[model samples]
Target: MCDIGLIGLAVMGQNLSLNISSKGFKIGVYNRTYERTEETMKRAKEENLVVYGYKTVEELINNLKKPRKVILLIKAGPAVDENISNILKHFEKGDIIIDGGNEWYINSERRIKLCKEKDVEYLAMGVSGGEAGARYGCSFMPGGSKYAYDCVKEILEKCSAQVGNSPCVTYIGPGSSGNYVKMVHNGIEYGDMQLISESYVIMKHILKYDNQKLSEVFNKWNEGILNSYLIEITANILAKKDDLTNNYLVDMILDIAGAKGTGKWTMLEATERGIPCPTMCAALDARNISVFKELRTKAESNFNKDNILIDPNEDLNDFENDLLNALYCCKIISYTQGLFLLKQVSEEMNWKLNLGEIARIWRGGCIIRAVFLDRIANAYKNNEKLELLFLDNEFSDDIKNKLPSLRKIVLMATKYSIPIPAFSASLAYFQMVTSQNLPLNLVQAQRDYFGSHTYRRTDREGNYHTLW
Candidate 1:
């Protein structure tokens, strides 16, 4: 009988409200436009959900329970702050406000500070998985006051979709950490999506397989080590043919990709922090470049082309299995780079983030949820300070054994002229981590040579040595 409020009725918000309602929570819903609210009420009535629709923000606030919990599920940007201002006018001190949008984490920090001044608790929670996942379960990254988190944890966890040792939600650090992690998650997701698409492009060009046949290959891959939500969806996306053209709909669709601002913002933040996340950045650039279709078309025209034809006689199913293994290995690398970046940031910020905890929470509900999360969770649990993911015992032997093959895959993709940001990132990360004599001394020497920056030797304490 817990009563909460939701302030948006878009596809994602509507579905999420249903998810909350299905968990037996009473909800007060408000949409700026009355029609959407009416639509939500109609659906709630059909579902026998206890929902009250508010015509205005004031009405919504007036009708809520004391110390109310209201989730703003609207678009990110000015609208978010405006909504907060409107709510604060009516919301008494100590009432909680939850932002469940793909907002920039820095904005969340600013909002948290504002709420603190007003004596209100504000939390920015990153909710992932599209409309359907919201109705079932989603990975929730909530950051703000720990005390406020406790109040909402029971509901969020209970409603979340989780796997064993894989809680679908977690309270990720303080300030904007939750959204910050989420921002990184999206940035990583950009690389992931691009990588998968590149894999498809390579397969398409090399094998010359029809979309339906390729889809079957993807489905087969879904059952193996690389089995993941992204792969499964890509398979489904390719399987369908357009009704009008009878062509592979995916190929026919605009190649231009769109992203919420979080992904780009992450790159900016990472750059400012002097973190190298080229995979994510490259993917963003690829997407940006895609918008110039004429340029892309001209570039494609000039480029030498190699077309792969599907040998109907060859075992298509077997090839699919091989593809699965390739994709799984690539995913491992992508996540490894992401986690490594997270570790560095955690160290810099002095926030003791439990990597094991992060993996568990992401296992089932988020877009990144896959079998690999279990491996990552175990890796952290086994060694709290495992400097690099590739060095982890689980991956060390396999990576060493399979790196040659992975390298070949990258080479093939490169030959096909497909952008494989994640795959490349994974390879680069592996190379960077495994290199023992990373000329930090050379950097030190260069600094001392040019800028008079002092160099400290690990072998000797306090004594400063200047290179002659």
Candidate 2:
């Protein structure tokens, strides 16, 4: 009699199950560990929600209605494969299996084929918004078999975050495209976080602002076009006081950042596809560099005289405004880079991804959700075949206007020895992409000389080599 079934009773699973139950659909829940299943049931009971906790995967399947729909929220990689094997034992023709993990897209593609052999429908679903969002509402990107999507569309739509009346859920193309989209989302998220951190560094070291002032500044920015969940939380994070000490909580925290593999996956895919995603790549590099904290400390001590201070004589007000504008510009460029990668991959993988709908769905729930995404969605809606986000007239003009500010900010960061890699990388990418000519002829000539790699003549149709 259960409307749907779910495996893995972790935080995300428990919350999503409750969310489905809250929407008036009975959800059968199971976990490898019986205690977690019991905990899920207890939590559901506390919320006065009905959740049928099962001891085994087969029991959960038996409880589900015909054409059974089950979502797997387990760990990615081997764990997901193991559960799928268990489910396949009980799954029949027309039954649907949705993998709602941060999985590698290739694995999902493999699972799609494997499920097809058994006549079972499979969906590589991307669920975002963390634990709280799972309980309330989150963005859902489900792709694979269209039949599977159609069967589970109602639950997804109902449980998804709503921007106005539109749910933050969509049928994101076919095969493993959903996973690919989510990976890009994480990549963009990494870029955003790095940019924000760079801005914080500027405020803290250059502008001589305290945590409260920084929080206020971010709060002010959130009221404008930069308004987003990340900004809002950052404001709150800055303002919070440490429970153990009188100092601001943010000051007590380490600069080191942690990340799952999604951002890395995005960079890998971009490299494999020969796409330029400099901003995202820079963000990943920042994390990698942060991991060498001991080496950084030693190097900093070894070169103590290298520390550069902000010019106190500079116009503070003007610089602050320029920094804000620069941050906004870099945000746009970062998104542009990520979207460009998505567009290229969609074509290469034959996913037929609707860039605009992807933007629209990202307007809520996802980590990179922002007012800016609305503009991107509009740009794509106006031109479905829009090659790059920056190519849109609105974005193009916006970047043109903001270019001076970005240049000033990058110059300032460089002069002050502040490592604003994301900002500088974005500016570099913008300049490179916009240039009509690049000094690559010499590079080609060198390649041809060293390795006999062929180079094309400006007027010729065929590849040629120089005998230097």
Candidate 3:
């Protein structure tokens, strides 16, 4: 009997089957197409690993040992529901069903209740690290039904990425916390990508560095505070050459950007909650605006900012250090906003989420795995009820230390008309957040004067309005 049976032999599903089996679990595999099952089995044989392939969901479920466990790693939408619908029929009450897809949190919440009705334990397990990590080690966020989670903890722990002898897997809170946390992780990932790309543009356009020079500089930073998977990959990307043209592949790529909706979802979630996560909002806006290549070209032809500030007149002083510190500082602010969102979400959802634990898990198998998360983990670990990450003593000191460089870079970008939306937004969010008094009160007066919208008094506690 298989120790665990996984449905959906997609990229993630297949590798995960192999990953656990390598750890000594008797893994079973199945896909809608028989071709995938055969290929996976043949591939497994090459590694001298036995992966049982089942013809149908029932067969896979039947092969599982007592208290069956099924993992779904396919698409995140209705297909997941379709798979569950079939599995629930043959699934015994004590059986465990784990959805390891990048599903929406609300979707998993519904699944949680549905499984409870059948007395089957369901887990919305967020599996990260993409294809490579899935095959070797990845981060796992398992939420809902601690009972189900306990049953499969060994398999998950054995298969997840390890950092310093710790597996990158944990029991997230009940009812969709796994999916919610993963969604926010991707949200932060988008912001990091945006931040890194902006720094690249500043160095490429202003600092006058070629590809090799850029790679050297990136490699240098990788050894510094900016050391992370994204930065390491970026350095490698800079070093890569195009096969046909013998040119840098990144430069060969078009300006058009793409997103898979996690960023959009984060923005929407922030908006609904009346949260001000301008860094994420700015990053999302850049991608959306980047999509309008045709309109941008047409607008460029129609308008020219001839009166804009010119490039510096004298011999340019290289401000690479400023750019570096600014990038690092902006990264913290981005995480600040992302964690702020998580903080708010956890409170409202009553997940009682361990924010520090979330940080530790990301320290290994996730895209946002960076040394910086260690700092964040320390922040929450020090003070679990921490209001905002920016208020954390270490983070706060870094902000003060680097704000000057951030200001300089933002000013330089403005002078060059270089678009640094995320960078600018990071600075803006910092200013807005730290300000004890804002100018919005005047706008409030305008609202009260015209439409009788209420405005609160600084002198008193009551809402008040003046008759015009």
Candidate 4:
């Protein structure tokens, strides 16, 4: 009998099946579309891997070992539910079903309960890293029944990327926390990309640097604390030239960014939980604003197009150092925001998530993987109940020392009429969070006057109503 049965024959599915097979597990592959299943078998043959391409889901399930393991790598919504329904027809009480997709956490929660009624073990696993990562190794966030996780732990660890000797796979607590964590990972990815783009814009406009110089700068940054997969790729992307025009490809590409709803979902959860994630929110808003290309073109055509030009004679060495410091500082703030949201949700949902473990898992394979995450993991390890990341002694000192540079860069961007939404929002969020007192008394009074939203007082214990 095959060690595991895998449904779906898409690129991800095929690659993952081959990856599992390569690790010495015989994986039975099946697809709703028979042609794709045959193609997967052909591809497996080329790799000299043992993959049994079954004609139907029942055939695959029946052929698997007792207490069968089936992984679903199909699309995220109703299709996943339909496949689960079909699998339940042949699945036994102790069988395991794993959904490895970018699914909504709430849906996973419902599925977990639904599977429990039939005594079938269910896992909502979040798989990260692109096509290549899928074929070799990637990060896996699996959470649900501990029994089910133990059943498939070996396969997950074998197929996951390793940092040192540790695989990028973990039991991410109970319920739908795995999906929630992955969603936040994508949200943090949005912030990281926006921060890098803002840095590029500053260098392009304020320093008048060309693409080659920009690539060099990014390459340099990647060798430092800012070193990460995203930064490394950005350097390559900046250096790439268009084949047809012999011009920098980044210059030729459209500015509009595409998203797949995870970032928006992060914002929705943050808003619902009353958690402030300004950096991520700014990143989401930037993407939303980018969609109005025609409006932007018209507005630019109609507006006075004056920009604060940099003097060529002025030395930019100090500014360059300041920019790097500022970028690093804002990155910490962005991550702090994302982590805080995770902390809040963990408490609200009773997930008991190990923030440190999550950070360690993300040190490889995932999009946001960086050397810096090692430090974050250490920080959480040092103090598990740490309220905010920046509050950690190691990060606090850096934030304190570099805050001036962040303020200076934001001011420079504002003076030059350049938009740095993520940077500026990070600064604002830091200020608001660290402040002891805010000018919200008037806001409270206004709320009481207009909407009767009863205001609380510092001087008194009871809610107060102002007759303004």
Candidate 4: 10-residue stretch with minimal lDDT: 307-316
Full-model lDDT, candidate 4: 0.91
lDDT of 1 by residue, 1-468 (tens): 247889989978888888888888877888998999888778878988767788988888877667788899988879988999998887767789999888777688889999888888988888888777888888888888887788788778867886864458888877777887887788778877877887787677766767888888778777866677888898989987788896878878877775558878877877888877767876887888878998878987998555554455644444434445556666667677678778888887766777888877877888887777778888989998887776788788767766766777776667546667767777776687668778788998888888777888878777465757
lDDT score, residue 151, model 2? 94
Q: Residue-wise lDDT of candidate 2 within 1-468, one digit each (tens)?
A: 999999887888999999999999989999989999999889889999999999978888898899999999888768889888888988889999999999999999999999999999999999889998899999999999999999999999999999999999989999999998998899999999999999999888778789999999999999997899999999999999999999998889886775558878988888878898898878888898888899989998887745456566776678888888899999889988898888888888888999889999999988888998999999998999888788889988888899999999988778778888899899999888988889898889889999999999888699887788
| TM-score of every prediction relative to native | 0.89, 0.97, 0.97, 0.97
Error of 4 at 368 (Å): 0.5
- For model 2, the superposed segments whose C-alpha errors exceed 4 Å read 305-308
**Model 3 lDDT on a 0 to 1 scale:** 0.87
- Among the numbered candidates, top TM-score falls to 2
- Clashes within 3 Å, all models in order: 3, 0, 0, 0
Number of clashes in model 4?
A: 0
True-structure RMSD for candidate 3: 1.8
lDDT scores of the candidates, listed in order: 0.78, 0.90, 0.87, 0.91
Reference-based lDDT, residue 51, model 1: 73
Report the Cα RMSD per candidate. Answer: 3.5, 1.3, 1.8, 1.5
